[PDB]
Write a protein that binds this ligand. Structure first.
Ligand SMILES: CC(C)n1c2c(c3c1-c1c(Br)c(Br)c(Br)c(Br)c1C3=O)C(=O)CCC2
Length: 333
């Protein structure tokens, strides 16, 4: 009788307990700023849905960053703006300063407070063991905060983390795919980038939750501690799950599919075949030796679980021994 329903283990009713205006972004009326307050200085980069510029607010002569959006539905613009406004001030969350429209073309643009143009993906393959732990913990702070505010990021990956390494500061960016979690709601499976998609997306299970982000985080952790970019290198959507199964084994995949009564495609079953689980230790080499510890492998094993309900929450992750010294060093700084 169709897929079994699912609920988030933590922060389940966070949005129910808030006023409707908190999460009803379609009803929200956007109050647009003045684009004439901002002059673009130079280009910083670009994405599938935006172009990113360094800019100056000439009313206060403050440096800012402007993300000019490509054409998308008004609903999605309103969603991203509401989410960013709701998370403003959160630990390690980018800070929206303004929203403007071009006077002529009416093209919308988001204005953020400035941070260092250093992408985590440019640094995370050369980190010390302790730096991997430290920056993982800072990402977790962002994820626990946004989940506690009822929001799933849904595009966690190295490219969406910015690092100011001199100040050991970190920001989670690119909230264009983020959504509010509501229990019982079915969500689009066309989220996250292929190498970071959780099994729930790859089997088209729509009643997912914050734990999607925890899978993506595990994929980042594995890539860093084994120096394999990406760790699960699928060449199409079905191959992404084949590659996962060649590591986690097919037994726990079929148990997951049965648990939620997921109806897989007949010959997707044949494609998956049968694969034994590999021990995590099998991906360690002489080069990454100093980055792999018992606690790292236990932590990774507890993030990369097929059953989304079995993965560590962000707070459970932050209390894992892998961060023990990290936590003690955060109390003295
Ligand atoms: C990697 C860089 C070019 N970049 C990208 C994005 C964003 C940035 C970026 C930078 Br740099 C800075 Br500084 C700030 Br502040 C902010 Br906000 C952003 C931001 O949102 C995307 O959203 C997707 C495409 C790549």
């Amino acid at each position: 009788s169709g897929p079994v329903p699912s609920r988030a283990r933590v922060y389940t009713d966070v949005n129910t307990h808030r006023p409707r205006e908190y999460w009803d972004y379609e009803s929200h009326v956007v109050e647009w700023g003045n684009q004439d307050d901002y002059q673009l200085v130079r280009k910083l980069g670009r994405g599938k849905y935006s172009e990113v510029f360094e800019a100056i607010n000439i009313t206060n002569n403050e440096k800012v960053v402007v993300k000019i959006l490509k054409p998308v539905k008004k609903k999605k613009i309103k969603r991203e703006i509401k989410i960013l406004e709701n998370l403003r001030g959160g630990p390690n969350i980018i800070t929206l300063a303004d929203i403007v429209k071009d006077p002529v073309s009416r093209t919308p643009a988001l204005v953020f407070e400035h941070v260092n143009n250093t992408d985590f993906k440019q640094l995370y393959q050369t980190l010390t063991d302790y730096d991997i732990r430290f920056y993982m913990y800072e990402i977790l702070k962002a994820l626990d905060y946004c989940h506690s505010m009822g929001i799933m990021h849904r595009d966690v990956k190295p490219h969406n983390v910015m690092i100011d390494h001199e100040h050991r500061k970190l920001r989670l960016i690119d909230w264009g795919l983020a959504e509010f979690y509501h229990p019982g709601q079915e969500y689009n499976v066309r989220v996250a980038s292929r190498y970071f998609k959780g099994p729930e997306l790859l089997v088209d299970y729509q009643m997912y939750d914050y734990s999607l982000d925890m899978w993506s985080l595990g994929c980042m952790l594995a890539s860093m501690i084994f120096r394999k970019e990406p760790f699960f290198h699928g060449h199409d959507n079905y191959d992404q799950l084949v590659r996962i199964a060649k590591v986690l084994g097919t037994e726990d995949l079929y148990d997951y599919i049965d648990k939620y009564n997921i109806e897989l495609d007949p010959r997707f079953n044949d494609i998956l075949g049968r694969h034994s689980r590999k021990r995590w230790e099998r991906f360690v080499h002489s080069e990454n030796q100093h980055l792999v510890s018992p606690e790292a492998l236990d932590f990774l094993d507890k993030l990369l679980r097929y059953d989304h309900q079995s993965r560590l929450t962000a707070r459970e992750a932050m209390e894992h021994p892998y961060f023990y010294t990290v936590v003690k060093d955060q109390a003295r700084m």
